[PDB]
Design an enzyme around this catalytic site. Structure first.
Site, PDB file in Angstrom:
ATOM      1  N   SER A  70      37.667  40.188  36.163  1.00 47.40           N
ATOM      2  CA  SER A  70      36.828  40.943  36.928  1.00 47.40           C
ATOM      3  C   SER A  70      37.470  41.084  38.536  1.00 47.40           C
ATOM      4  O   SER A  70      38.663  41.583  38.444  1.00 47.40           O
ATOM      5  CB  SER A  70      35.432  40.282  37.187  1.00 47.40           C
ATOM      6  OG  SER A  70      34.922  39.681  35.991  1.00 47.40           O
ATOM      7  N   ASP A 112      38.266  48.595  60.617  1.00 50.46           N
ATOM      8  CA  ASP A 112      39.576  48.143  60.768  1.00 50.46           C
ATOM      9  C   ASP A 112      40.051  47.240  59.623  1.00 50.46           C
ATOM     10  O   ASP A 112      40.597  46.167  59.974  1.00 50.46           O
ATOM     11  CB  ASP A 112      39.963  47.748  62.208  1.00 50.46           C
ATOM     12  CG  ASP A 112      41.598  47.562  62.321  1.00 50.46           C
ATOM     13  OD1 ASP A 112      42.443  48.041  61.437  1.00 50.46           O
ATOM     14  OD2 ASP A 112      41.850  46.934  63.303  1.00 50.46           O
ATOM     15  N   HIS A 123      30.922  42.888  29.735  1.00 49.58           N
ATOM     16  CA  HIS A 123      31.981  42.204  30.691  1.00 49.58           C
ATOM     17  C   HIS A 123      32.381  40.807  30.634  1.00 49.58           C
ATOM     18  O   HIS A 123      33.609  40.095  30.874  1.00 49.58           O
ATOM     19  CB  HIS A 123      31.369  42.751  32.099  1.00 49.58           C
ATOM     20  CG  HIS A 123      32.121  42.340  33.225  1.00 49.58           C
ATOM     21  ND1 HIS A 123      33.095  43.136  33.791  1.00 49.58           N
ATOM     22  CD2 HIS A 123      32.385  41.255  34.268  1.00 49.58           C
ATOM     23  CE1 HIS A 123      33.566  42.927  34.767  1.00 49.58           C
ATOM     24  NE2 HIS A 123      33.236  41.618  35.245  1.00 49.58           N
TER      25      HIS A 123
END
Lengths: 448, 448, 448, 448
Positions: free
Chosen positions: A147, A370, A423
């Site tokens: 993951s 940022d 998953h």
């Protein structure tokens, strides 16, 4: 500074712990934090010279596996490697940012300006600070990422690839090449989430009336919900969060049905009313992880930011699909209610009691423009380190198109697409994942 | 009345649910109770005729197994039978006595006169009410009992044994032949609990300082213990009950060490104090079952009574051992503090928040002296039903010296004494437990 | 009319032949045709009643498996069904249209008016004609289709779906929804063929020079080629067809390397000229199937047609990709020569001596319109028969994008996508394919 | 002069090619010849020191194995040895004597004076010239040989025993002790060939009429046969040659029956003549190997010569059995017609189109006297090299009684007689053949 404990045993294995003191920000000498790792071997191999494997854990705030016995991928890996399990910054035993720990800051500005140091780029700088001290002659090592540990692995291929012998990734190739990819992730995520709901009700047809009844009862209640045992709220929006593991994980459909069996409480004394069960309210309050691993709530969208803010990207994109995802439209139109997963919303910092004091700091993160870079596409297009990946065709956490488009920008990558796993597939039959991914790099299944 | 659902699928299993309406008290027609059972078979065998097997669950107040995949003992049992899983009275989907449900009764006298219908001698009358309607031609069935399910199976060997083909038991042989055996059980219990504490501190030596420091901090806090998220308290008495599953279950030793690694929060900002971690408090509150299954607290000692009052026997016997089990004595005399297990004390109803309103009803049960009998030793002394028992030599939860004397009264019992499993053994390679038990009855391993 | 032979034996298997007399074309009473099928069972089960399985063979114009021992998927299937292997009309023992057998027709129009009866819809009418006579009670049976047998299976889901218990498909989902899909199938085919050529030269870097030196000597020779033993010719265009078996299957990359080592013969006597080796010309003439199965040339592009002509669609498409696929541009521009896929070209009937007389009948088929339809989408949309399909992600013969969109028009299809196997995946590792594809229908893997 | 290539991969194996320059005749040191050996190891073992194994392929003039995966004996050998596969001189890449390459010689005398250097004594000179510069320290190696490769191995034990660690043979023990043994071999050969035909028609009774009808058609055809696609002729003596691999090899009985189903083309047009199939004539032309490996015809009987000429010994010996082997007598008497074994006849050079020009050089070889030695019985009678042999009781190719006399002259030989396997056995059960023969030498199965 570097210190380590005595060996100890669990059935079939030997374990030891290591602790390092490392910079908070590598732009400075000070302040420092502790970072923790655990070394694992098969019985009788304590002193044996062997190659090293680093494991990188699957989620933005989760800790290392903590095994009770040899099983699954760890048992297999110990047939060849010294295994190193790393507790990532701010989690496990590496300077934990628990819901109590983050109350030490007086103001949201101080907390936000601390949390920005904990990210994928610094996780890779800490891994490089470990191998130069832990590995004999500072030799290269192999890495395995599940993951988000796969997103850490591509940052490691981008910056400091000199330490890598070979890379293995499970369900963990990110999208790359934009200042913030989060909008393309969630726009595709709602479509797999809608398809997983289809499969669930097709398998368990009776549940459509059960969730309908429960969504009415929660919405007709005086607050639009009911109080949980730990002072939070359950609401029809809160109920829709069960899909995060209930639809995407390998046992999810099985468990979610057995929980919806126990919703109402029985009438023992005649004339008493129908009521929501204390067992269901306790089970719901114990189902999620945000009250325990709060970095999985705070830093989740920030894993996609590479030059622009996410601005609560999942919460915007819900409005593109809310004609089907509104629980109140579903019960009005006689449609099934849809569950949701791997996505977070502003109101979770209102309903979940342990997140209440972090409502301000979560917005200072959501508005940060940022963010420094995470990947280096010109380098990945020129890569020399061998890479193997397991890619799952019907995965709701990472979308298949975004994976295969990105895989074209890594030079030598080999991958297997399979439909046969969810998953969770490194845990569920993990042994054969390690055999299949090593087999490509080792030369047992050559270019095909 | 009897109603039956449609079949549903779990990987490699076919499952169906049955619901029965049953007398609260068989001495009369009404009021009624709903009893629930789940029938399980392997794929493609829904219509096939096979022998039946009943599973009796291991504890007062617990629901049945709730399988999410075939693998375990259930996979093996489905190679020969169509396993029936019974939710016992008040425990699961059979009219549960949750906290929110027991609040319907207006006085402690009403709740205490209701709870006395929820014992083993009625759970066996419901099993007989079921097989005459569920099994073809009302044939006999085999029964498998884990822990307290073995105590139910012995009442079945004494009352209506005509329905039994053979009995399989794991742990679960009670002491019999006194009006109250609870004093004798707990006088043996503190001896194994002392032994198992020795082994824990022999394996993980550094924890001797970790529990010390923690007991001092919990004793120095205001009014003793620190407050838990659900409104309970963590006193040093509360810390000692952590060993209930931690010392007596097979995974418990490793899992208890990994919890004690997490006790304190890090000093992230200067001048912040040493403090107990929100992760540890949440884990402690998640560890014990008494808020989830309160019938496990209320009716625990009451399984040992046949016409005499228990009177909080576990709390009487503690004073005999207080010289070593008092946490305040251990921190002063530098000895290790000891944890405890399978013993319930009066103060838990003052201190576990979900139990706060039930203190009065728990005392009305504790002072009751005219319980009906559970067993019939003259019929066990003439038994014809085949019986196989797995007996664990170092079991914390039922004591070997009390088992081996009771095994002289069961007329034809075969039993297999082993050191190699803890009480959890049916869930720890249960495939070989069921094969070995059946092999003694079936004739693969004849008498020697 | 229907006849059957006596049982005969092969190691661990017992075979038997059945022969049926069938109309050449339905809606008419004559002329007749013979059709051959072979029943197979495991040892001793000849008299035992079991479900049937039909195998539909994977090339247009290919006879059935003809086994020498119990092995692969036939070893597995005979544990459960009474496998029937069908020689499709015009092939094997069923009225064989051999390269001399087709010379009985006195003109190209006579031949063309015969070949139009040998499509996939008539193969399904033959399979229906067999079941109602061969199967006890005329019950339903399970069908298995590799490649073009999967195209046949979708016409059997379109027409006569009553005969089917469940359908298994392997690498064999056709494109659907246009009058002629062949331009799409090829637009996509040259893309995958270019990919497989990249992998071949990446693995065996030395072969780039060996095909450039060989294409040159062939282009310099008389007529741009050299004579084969049967009087055909090898040319740089003819050499490219080695890519069909060479690049698309599971042993092709290795077989093609071992054949390119053998190209030149040695100077035994000094001053003897450098020449092309007889082992290479004999192995090239032995590599293809067009000399043995001429129906695999003549009816190949017709399998994509419903009410519109193909008009040499593979030849029409290579003109779009000419700049890379031209072998003389490749040697001039100093680029590797590419090999081609499962394509047929007008010139192939001039180069290959067995095909020479059929050149005229090939055009009368390639230009034929008003081909009767093969699929019924409005019945596929509301299908009720269970369907499982193995789908290969890097298949050179059926394109994944065309497969995955066509699978959306079958109501209940359970496809599994994989990269582990090539198109030949029922021959190699065939056991796995039958266990996995049955497991998705039977109940071993329910929907997730 | 010695050269070596770079490594390449196939599934589970690593391969590399070595090329050596050797003299044509070791007594003159000129001209030169190039010899090729391929080295094989399992994955990741390219550098590791382990013992060498040489394989001798054992058809005169056949190419070495040419593997495309790990399976059979090579998969097992690579668990212990560095496997080296030698292309014997005159075949494969070791300066091939294919049809087109022998046509460089100006006259039959020149060709014959070349072929006398391509025998088994020089193959041992070449193998010793390799060991001394391929093997580290020039150490001894183990050797393996099937068929004529075990022929070669007794000349190695006769003339170069210094290089042999141990010898393994799979049915390659020849009859030594005479100046030409070929008359003994063919005298005993026709007895086995007759007993194998009796087993064939007992297994497939329906074939008796098929071969008779076909022999009549071939004999009544213009010029005594029918013309093959390559311009050869199928005569009724040519049809009997199917037996060479159709009777004595492991799948031969199965294949030969399936081929005899395909003999006649159908009648699609009424009044067309009944005809031999183009499928059958192409399959027959593809059955035999003499077009592909002409050295297998030219140097066959030469392996039995040690100072006397063979004089077409199989053609002469046939006269003793003509009363049952003549196909024309068999049809007139209404007997079954018998297929022949591994043997060559003067008329093959008149009928096999590739052999036509070598007719003269074949007779110069068949009349040659002064062939040099192959064996040294005064050394074999006091051999000290360990030897293990698999000896097959019903072998068509080497007669059992000629093996059991020869095995009395080798000093230390251990041989296992079995009836489990036909002559092909090392390719049918490879793994267990290598385990069982090494088990005698290694001390798993001591003298007994």
């Amino acid at each position: 500074e570097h210190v380590t404990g005595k060996w100890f045993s669990v059935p079939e294995l030997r374990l030891r712990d290591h602790r390092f003191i490392v910079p908070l920000d590598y732009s400075k000498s000070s302040p420092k934090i502790t970072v923790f790792a655990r070394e694992i071997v098969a019985v009788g191999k304590e002193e044996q010279a062997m190659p090293y494997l680093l494991y990188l854990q699957g989620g933005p705030g989760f800790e290392g596996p903590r095994p009770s016995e040899a099983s699954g991928w760890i048992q297999r890996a110990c047939e060849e490697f010294r295994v190193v399990l790393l507790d990532q910054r701010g989690t496990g035993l590496s300077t934990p940012l628990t819901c109590s720990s983050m109350l030490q800051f007086k103001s949201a500005k101080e907390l936000a300006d601390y949390l920005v140091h904990f990210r994928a780029d610094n996780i890779v700088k800490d891994a490089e600070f470990i191998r130069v001290r832990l590995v004999p002659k500072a030799d290269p090592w192999t890495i395995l990422g599940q993951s988000f540990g796969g997103f850490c692995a591509l940052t490691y291929l981008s910056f400091a690839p000199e330490g890598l012998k070979q890379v293995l990734i499970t369900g963990g190739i990110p999208p790359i090449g934009k200042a913030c990819t989060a909008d393309d992730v969630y726009e595709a995520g709602f479509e797999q989430v809608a398809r997983q709901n289809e499969k669930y009700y097709k398998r368990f047809p009776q549940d459509i009336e059960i969730v309908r009844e429960l969504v009415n009862y929660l919405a007709e209640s005086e607050g639009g919900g009911v109080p949980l045992p730990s002072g939070g709220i359950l609401t029809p929006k809160g109920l829709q969060t069960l899909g995060l593991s209930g639809l995407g994980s390998s046992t999810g459909f099985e468990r979610l049905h057995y929980m919806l069996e126990r919703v109402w409480d029985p009438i023992l004394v005649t004339g008493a009313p129908k009521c929501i069960s204390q067992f269901f309210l306790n089970a719901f309050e114990s189902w999620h992880s945000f009250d325990t691993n709060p970095l999985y709530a705070l830093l989740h969208e920030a894993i996609y930011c590479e030059g622009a803010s996410s601005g609560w990207s999942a919460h915007r994109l819900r409005d593109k699909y809310e004609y089907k995802f509104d629980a109140m439209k579903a019960v009005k139109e006689s449609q099934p209610v849809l569950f949701t997963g791997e996505m977070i919303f502003p109101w979770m910092f209102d309903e979940i009691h342990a997140l209440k004091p972090f409502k301000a700091a979560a917005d200072l993160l959501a508005k940060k423009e940022d963010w420094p870079p995470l990947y280096d596409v010109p380098r990945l297009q020129n890569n020399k380190v061998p890479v193997a990946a397991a890619v799952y065709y019907e995965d709701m956490y990472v979308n298949f198109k975004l994976v295969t488009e990105t895989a074209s920008h890594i030079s030598g990558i080999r991958l297997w697409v399979t439909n046969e796993f969810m998953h969770s597939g490194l845990r569920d039959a993990g042994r054969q994942i390690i055999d299949h991914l090593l087999g490509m790099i080792n030369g047992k299944k050559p270019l095909f």
